[PDB]
Each structure stands twice: as structure tokens, then as C-alpha cells.
Amino acid sequence: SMNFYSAYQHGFVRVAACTHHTTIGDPAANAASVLDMARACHDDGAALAVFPELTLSGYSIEDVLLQDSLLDAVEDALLDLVTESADLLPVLVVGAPLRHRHRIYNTAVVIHRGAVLGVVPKSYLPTYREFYERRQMAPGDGERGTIRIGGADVAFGTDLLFAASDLPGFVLHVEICEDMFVPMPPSAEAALAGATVLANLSGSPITIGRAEDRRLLARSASARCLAAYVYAAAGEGESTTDLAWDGQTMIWENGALLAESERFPKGVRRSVADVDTELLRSERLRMGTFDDNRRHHRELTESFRRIDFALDPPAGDIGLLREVERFPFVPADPQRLQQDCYEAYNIQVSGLEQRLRALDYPKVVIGVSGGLDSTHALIVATHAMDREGRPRSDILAFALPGFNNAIKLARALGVTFSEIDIGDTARLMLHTIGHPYSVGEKVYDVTFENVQAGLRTDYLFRIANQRGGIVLGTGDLSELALGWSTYGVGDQMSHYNVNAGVPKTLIQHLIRWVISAGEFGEKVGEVLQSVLDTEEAKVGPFALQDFSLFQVLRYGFRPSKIAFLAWHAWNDAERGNWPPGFPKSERPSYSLAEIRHWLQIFVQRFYSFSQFKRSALPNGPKVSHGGALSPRGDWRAPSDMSARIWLDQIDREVPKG
Amino acid sequence: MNFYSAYQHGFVRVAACTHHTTIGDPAANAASVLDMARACHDDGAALAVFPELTLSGYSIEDVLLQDSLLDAVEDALLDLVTESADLLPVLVVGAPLRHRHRIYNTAVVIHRGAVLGVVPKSYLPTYREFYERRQMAPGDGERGTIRIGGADVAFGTDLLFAASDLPGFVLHVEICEDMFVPMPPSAEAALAGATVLANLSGSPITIGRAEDRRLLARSASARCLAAYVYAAAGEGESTTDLAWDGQTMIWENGALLAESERFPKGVRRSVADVDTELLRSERLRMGTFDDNRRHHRELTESFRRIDFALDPPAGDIGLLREVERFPFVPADPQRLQQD
Amino acid sequence: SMNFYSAYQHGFVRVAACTHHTTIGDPAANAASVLDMARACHDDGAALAVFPELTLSGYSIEDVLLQDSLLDAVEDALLDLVTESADLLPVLVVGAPLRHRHRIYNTAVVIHRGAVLGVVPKSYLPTYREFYERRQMAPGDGERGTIRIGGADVAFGTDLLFAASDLPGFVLHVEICEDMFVPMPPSAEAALAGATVLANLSGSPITIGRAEDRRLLARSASARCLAAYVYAAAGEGESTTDLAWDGQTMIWENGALLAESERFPKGVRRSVADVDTELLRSERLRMGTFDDNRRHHRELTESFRRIDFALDPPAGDIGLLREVERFPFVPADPQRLQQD
């Protein structure tokens, strides 16, 4: 029923940070630039346009700010901006020196559809080094009440909130340059109070190192406040009597850079981006210490004044001004991925090391199939042993054939290798149980499969008892998610699971990383390389199910939200980025029908079927910021629930193709 | 004047330590802590910050609620306190402690034979892999005092520790998640006059989490014109569900001063000389810092100030600081090119 | 003049504590059960129907409470039950996890005749032993103002009172499970402020002796507060991953049990009872120290928001859902009489 292709309908809000052409001392001209940039924002369906500090006057005009004609010109340019915004869709936030009581205030006028919503004075006026703001301007910290603008008294002060009434996840707070540089920023309290989108208007003359400073503090604010941060600085046109301007603009969301514009531009620039208000909602919803902090400053936070406006955003397809990656567990940026891998690996190793220290260095029993997972776990187990000064021959690896890679790796590593043929025991069990296969019937059902799976595990566990060892778990996060494993006796069961927290899509990249580090050597490298090259299509592509895993595990997003995201990430193979190690051939695209089909399978398997196998999970380290699936940790759920509501949301909300 | 004395030039030698945790065994944690504090003492350091719940192990879950665990924590604490009589640095050591109805996630500040104060963690994460509110009480809003082996020492989140013989050294302590909330305890402490912010962390390691620690510890220090001293738990913490990297780091006004190896084998210390005069000078010049204090006057004037005397070394103990030859010309090539 | 045979005209108010069938993670199914039980309360001429904690979602679902589709479905089911209450007599009190500001709260939604009257957050969230509530849910104590439920700002908080303008002896306070277990329960203060009927929605997984703990505290609450105490625990349908559920319901009045239902029922159960509002009026009129305690906690008892609604209860003969002893001075129970 929703327009599935509408970003507004998926909880996005389009925000724009703008740097305009300053004509200092000339508000009619600054207004005219602002208006032209506002119309481009409207055209883009943006709900917010933040301009630089003192937009209407020029930031750098010094005592020209005290000139009657300057002040008067400003006021008339504003009233004209307001009249024009009648037919503009975005909330406009626009700097202006304004008269109130005894002084001029460095203010931000929040404008929307033909009416001022509020005027926000700069709380904090730098009067040091190259800044002289206390000379011409009065602090706004702790002023309240109203201000008369064009025949209307409108909220004036630093405790204002602009809550969109048709967009409950968009609640705007405004501050101004130095406001965000002090230990206790205005916007920190406003996030506790309920602001989701934090605007900052800057003049910010540019200096060596200062752009890093802007970034450090706008980014960490967005992270610590679980907010978007929208930041605009002055550029061309400001006075160069003592200073220069770079016109930097940027948008942050929860510590991530959504957009940024060119530094030192010829001409005006914008950062436009889609902010995910559900990501912010979900993060707040889960970090209760955020609410604990609000209740600690209840007086501060409850004092805020909330101004409403109907945003009435466009209903149609307007694209997604957002970078949605194909692999939420696998960053496309190669130095970021190198970092994840370093960390994944060391997490797995140190987790297991502690298990081994704690048990006075047991032997290490591991089933090696030549697959990616067991291959990787062997490597992890080898490094653990090295670091602890234990002989590699204390790793007891077992090939367990049922009805080359493993053996080569085992020998290259120098671990104790052995083959145990489970065939005769499988045969005897299938007969004892009266399975049709024991009388010739080619019935290859779950029992047939499980009898083997189970016996592998049964054997390893008995070896472990007999030989003073522990069985290493091999199953990865994606398997835990789907219940693609054999419960209890089999697969799912071990003394310690190193891959438990690692999703399937990340596994190959870990091996790549192991080869690259080169620490094991030429032959080991070669065998590992070989394992990658030699190496379930009814649970779907793991690339799709890991995409779904991240949205549910981190954010709890509804299914139609996940389809939207996956479709945007995976729809066109030629668009967006791929991590290292995907040859052009190895680069699939997925249709909406494909994405929808496998998501139906995900919700059913994840929410309903698989919890019970997750519920009795061996020990192992959590790996990913995306979460892990331990029932003692990240994922607490019933083993006895239907996924009806998720499947119903897909029927109603996600188009069939 | 001793020209070659870092202390006489307004420096304070600060240390962030990651010890070897023996979970559920306080006496052994105190042994690892005491060993590392003597190393710090030898280095002429004035502060040693250890990880969250140092004396118990952070990761022991309901073992925290076991009586023998708490008795042993207290006996170990009292012995640590006894041993510092001879130790130059102020020790900041985590412990689960009984006060009133519950146990608190505390940092105990220890100097020269006495406890100076006890600081409860303010915000207790109870989400994802964190379960802290199950065993432990929030420290936010708590004041008054606490009985530690025959003395009533200050207890609460509003404490400053000032070196009467070294005024640029003013210490505030917060614990792990305390630095991740919109309005950290430590932001208010800086306005009240804290120049050195300690953070004891447990902080199970996850992909990306060091970047997060970094961002908030660096941005804290820059926003608050302070040194920020961070110490996380490492080897020995339970790996039932989690992994530990024992990261320690020292920031100053946005700059990184020192940091230690991640996932070390064995104990590690970051040690660095903090320029209290740097901090002093930035504070002096940035008036809007003090404007912010005055806006939160009642918040910032209520802090309690505990005095101690450091009596630091008079002599030449080198300088644990990278002083660039060209303040105007970064030696780092990437940075120089950016400049 | 008066219809002599009308319990309402004699200052009685009919109340139901209900235990419904849970379908964990399925609010439309929970709502259909609720609506059906509410229709039976209406047919009984009940003024009030209390359902178990988190009625709409299921109490036992843990992190599923944090799912957008869980919360959205909860909201939609809730709106339909409010639309369906247009034709129902009783105030319904149904549990639901609802978003407010940063988090979800464990709430009771007080519903009457096509509108929501108020939304009461659980005050104290057990985070110990088998309970994990602070992980998913925010505490409700100290929270005021309002919440937007389907295009309407309705009172929100632990300071709320639902007073019948046409039945002045019926003044309702709602609290949730653990709220009655703490040294200073929210219902205690609400009694001093005027509440005469105290509702408790519970999840309360069952354990050896726990029904005895519920009784101890519901009973003594009703006696110490000179009030009716209406209590519903969760039942069949709830997750048995780690817990079991007994579906216990009970109605107390000044220390005396009015009604209680079968434990571990197969199917839905109710306690329905006529509460004597004049009996409560009478005990309060006479025990001045009750009012002395109110004036001692004057600031605390005077800030409750009173929310009015008209009941229009039935005027005719609907019998009397109450034990009336032939000999008030001679208890018909042998063990009780022997003691007397």
C-alpha cells in the first residue's frame, strides 16, 4: 500500500547543508543567493536547508554589524525570505544579526512555509584570538520568551525544538558555531530533550588544522547524541581583511559521514543527504543509558519548547541520497576491511586462548572438511597455540569422510592429522533405527544427513574425552542466524566456538587477510589460496541473508525497510562499491522479487524456527559491532514464536516484483 | 630551579595500566596492580589508572553478588591501600563495593596510605552484551560518604582531587560508559576545574570499538581542554561471550600522547608527561569555556574538592613527551602535505 | 423511586480481572482475545476489565519487544481495540509496549468508549533473577505530560486517576506487577489521593510459593489502603523458554477475597465481582488516620491528575456478584468460626 520506492515513506529525511555567496554588508544580495539555493533544495525534496552563520549580514563585517542601515536591511531581507518560503518545501535555517531588548543577537531564524517558527541566539560568543563577537553581540545563553518579527511574536531562545508533526522522527535543534565546542553544548541537552537532527551554522574562518577540528566535534557530537549533525560554514565573499573562508559543509549521522562538499569552492555548494530517522530511533531505543542521562538532567530536558509544523514531504520516488553497502559486515573501503579483519582474527584467537589457559591447555580436537569455516578455525587455533607456547601437534585434526585441502593444510601447519571413516558407524546406526537406506533405499532425508552430522560430533566429543581435549566449534554467525546446522548432537555443538560471531560473508576475507599477512608461510598460504579457489542454495545467497541479519540484529528494522535497503544496495551490480576480492564475473545483482523471496525465508527461519538451536549455544567471542547471536548476550528471544507478523508486513508492504 | 625537572616545568607524569585479570580472585588482581604501581612509582608517575572492576574482574556477572567475592575484594583493597603508603602515584582502582542496599561499580582513589574518595559509575549499560544493571546500582546523583576500613571517605560522582602542591593537576574519575552519553560526568567536572579526566574501562572488544573509544576520548579531551586517561581490560577476562584487547591511551587537548599495544601478551602501560601549563593556557584564552561554566553554575559549583599532596620528584627524570622541532611544520608527511 | 434490585443503584461497581490467551509476537491475535473477553464483561455489566502485563505483545518475548514490526503491530491492534470500545461498557485496561520519547515503556492503556483515557508506565522494572526488563524498557516513575496515540495527546504517567463522574465511589488507579512489591507502591499514594479501585496488570511467571506472594501483597495492599485490588497474571500462550505461567486472577476488597480464578486453566478465565464502593467510603470516613497520612504526604497526593469519564452503568436487575453472609457475626466457614 505504501509507495515502496519513496524514501520519505521508509523513515528517511532529506537534509541539506548550504554554503552561499557572501556579499558582505548587503543583505538583499545574501538573501537572493539563499533563495536560489533554497529553491534547489525544494527541487531536491529536501526538508531542511542550513546556511552559514550570519547568512544575511556577512559574518565578518565587525562594527558594520552595529550600523542602523545594516540591521534595517537585514530585517527587510528576512521578511522577503519568509514571504518566498510560502512555496518552499524545506525548513530554512538562516543566520542574521537581530535586535532584541538591548542588543543584537547572533541568531538563526528557523523559517518554514511563510512563517518564522523560531529565532535561536548563539549561546556562546568567542572573544579571543581572531574572534571579537562580545564587542558587537549579546550571548543567547538562557534567554527565552519571544521576539517580534514582521508582526509576530515567535519563540526566541536556545531551548527550542522543531518537531515535524507528520514526521515524528524529525525533531530539529539549532545551534551556532562555537556552541558545539564547549564542554556542555546546547545540542547535547537538546538531544536528551528529543532532537534527532542537530543543525550548526558556522562562520569559522579557515586555518591550518581547523577543518579536522570541525570534523572531530561534529562527528563525535553525532555519535554521542545518536543524531544527525548538519554543518555549514561561510566561504567566498566574506572579508579577507585578516582571515580566509573555505565554505565547508557536511552531514554526519551517528558518527558516519553522509556527505560533504568541496573545500574552497568556486561558487556555491551543498551537501544533500538522506538521514535514516529509524537508525537513530533504533539506536536510542536500545541504549537505555541515553535515557538514564536524560532523567539525570530532567529539569534541563523537560524545559524545552516544542514547535510544530507539518512538513508534508513528497510521496513519490525521489531516489536515495545514501550510500547503502552490499555487505554490512564487509566494508568496501580496503583499509577499513584490513582493520576489521585484524580485529576479527585477534578477537577469535584471544577468546580461544583464554579458554585454553583456563583449562590448563587441553588438546584441541577439530573436524576439518576442507571448507572455509573449518579451514579458518584451524588457522585461528594454530595461532592461539603458538601465542600460548603450545605444540602444534596438540591440535588433533580429523577428516571424517561419510557417504585434499584439509589434509594438505593440516600437514603444512604441522598439526596432528587423522582420518576416521564414519561410514561403518553410520550404516550400523541407520540399520538399528530401521532407516530405509539400510535396506537399499536411496532416501537421503534429514535423518540420513543428521545421522552422519551427529556421528562426526559424537566421535569428536569422545576423542575429546579420551585424549584430554576440547572440540572446537566451526559454525559461523550466518548459520546460527538461519539454523543451518544440526541441533544438539551435531554441528551446532562444541566446547568452544571460534566462528560463532563471524558471519559467512566475512569468513573468506579473513582467510585472504591470513594469506596477506604471510605469517604462516609459502605452503600454508598456497593451501589457503587453494581453499578459497575450490570454494545451501535453498536458504538463499548468504550475501542477502547477512544483509538482513545486520538490519534485524542491529536495528530491528521492519521487513519492507530491509527490502528497500537491500534493493538499493544490490539491484545494480554496476552501481556502488564492492569489497576487495570480487572478480567482475563474481558480481551478482538481485531483483526485488529475489530480495523479497529470500527475506520471507529469513524472517520465518530467524524469528520462528531457529531460536531453539541458538538457545543452547556453546561459548565463543562476539566479533562484530553489528552484533552476535548468543542468548547470554546480544539476542534474547523465545524458542516458541511464530513469524506471522513479519510475513504479513511483506505481503502488505513489499511489491511482488 | 632544577631546569631539567619535568615537574618543575609544569608537567604531570600520568599512567594508564592494563593488568592481568584473574577473574573472581581479588588477591591476585591486587598483586598485578601492586606490581604495576611500583613500576609507575619508579618512573616518577603521579597517577595510575587501571581497568573497570580491576579487583574482581569486570566480566564475572553474578559472581559479583557472591559474599566471598566481596569480602575478598575489600580485603584486597585494604591491603592495596596499605601498600601505597610508600608509593608516589595516586592509584585509581576499580572495585565492586557495598554501600547502602546494593553494590556499586566503583573507582577507588588511593594515595600514600589513604583512600581519597570512591566514585561510582554513573551509567550502567544494560543492552546488547552488557547486563550491568542486573548486579549493580547506578551511581548518578549519589553523594555523602562510604565506610572503607574504619574511615568515612567521600563517595559520589561530584569529586575533584587536587594536588595542593601542583595546582594544574586536578583529577576527575568516570567509568567506561560514563564518557559515551550526551552529557558526560566529566564535561561538568572539567567546567568545575578538573584538568585530568580518568576513565576505567571494561569494554569488551568488538570490530570497530577502538575507533569508538578513540573518537570519544579524543573529543572529550579537546572539548574539555583536558588530559584524558583511558585504560581497558585485557587478558584474563572471561571469554564465555566476549574478547578483550587491553587498550590504554592518553590524550591531551585532542593530541594522542601515548597508547599501548592491543591484544598484548602480558601487562602494558601508557606513560606520558601532560603539559598542565598547555591546558592552563588554553583555558585562559577560551573565555567561552568559562561562560559555559557560569551557565551551569549550580551544577559546576557543587563539586567537592579533596586535597592531597603529591611531593613529586625534584630531579631530572627525562621527558615522556614528543616535542616536535617545527611546531609550524609537521614531521609527519601526510599531515605536512595537508597543512 | 430507585430500582431496588440494581447493584449499581446501591453503590456497587462490577469489576473483572481477566486472563486471556497469549499469542507471543502477535498483537492482532492478542487483541481478538481481549475484545472477546471484553464483550463478555460488557454482557455481565462490568464497569472495569483488567488484562495481564503487556497483553498486546506477550510479556515473555524479550528482544522481540525491540522490533519495529512488533511495535507497529502493537500500535495498530491498539487503535482497533479503542475503536471497538465505542460500543463497550467497561473501562478496559490493556498492557502494551509503547514508544515515548527515547524508549518503549511497559504500559497499561486505559480505554473507554472509543477514546484512550490515559497511559500508565510500569514504575519499577525488575532486573534480577529471571527478569530482564531494563534491557528493553524504560522506567516510568517521574514521567508526566502526554503521549500521542492515534492523533490524540492523552495523559501519560504514574500520577493518574480515572474518576467516574456518575459513580463517584469508583476512582481507578492502575499500576503494573512489580509496582506493588516495593516498599512504597504507587498505588498507596494513589489511594491517599482518592483512588478506591486499584488495578494491577501482571506477567509474573509462576514459581513455588509465588501465588502466595501475590496474595500476601494484593491482600494487604487492599486492607492497608482501604481499597479494592484487581489483579490479572499472564497465562497460556506465553513463552516457556525458561518459565511457566499460571493465569491467576483475583479481586480483593479491604483484605477480603471477593473472587479468584482457576490456576493453570485450560482456556481463558475471569474473576468478576461486585465491589461495594460504600463499604470503602465507610471505612475511610471512620479511620481518620488514613486522611492524616494523606495530609502528611500532601504535595505527593495533591498533584495527581484526575481524568473524568461517564460510565452510564446499567440501571436494571443484573443480580449481585457477591457473597453476602447471613450472619455477619457468625462466619459460615467452620475453621473461621472456630477461631472467632
Ligand SMILES: Nc1ncnc2c1ncn2[C@@H]1O[C@H](COP(=O)(O)OP(=O)(O)OC[C@H]2O[C@@H]([n+]3cccc(C(=O)O)c3)[C@H](O)[C@@H]2O)[C@@H](O)[C@H]1O
Ligand atoms: N522449537 C524447538 N524446540 C525444541 N526442539 C525443536 C524445536 N524445533 C524443532 N525441534 C526439534 O529439533 C530437530 C530439528 O533440528 P535439527 O536436528 O538441526 O534438524 P533440521 O534443522 O530439521 O535439519 C538440519 C539441516 O540443516 C542443514 N545442515 C546441517 C548441518 C550442516 C550443514 C552444512 O551445509 O554443512 C547443513 C542440512 O540440510 C540438515 O539436514 C527435530 O528433532 C525437531 O523436532
Ligand SMILES: *CC(=O)CC[C@H](N)C(=O)O
Ligand atoms: C565559529 C567558532 O566558534 C570557531 C572557533 C572555535 N573555538 C575553533 O575553531 O577552535
Ligand SMILES: *CC(=O)CC[C@H](N)C(=O)O
Ligand atoms: C568502555 C569504553 O570506553 C568502550 C566500550 C563501551 N562499553 C562501548 O563502546 O559501548
Ligand SMILES: *CC(=O)CC[C@H](N)C(=O)O
Ligand atoms: C510482578 C513482577 O514483576 C514479578 C514479581 C516480582 N518480580 C517479585 O519480586 O516477586
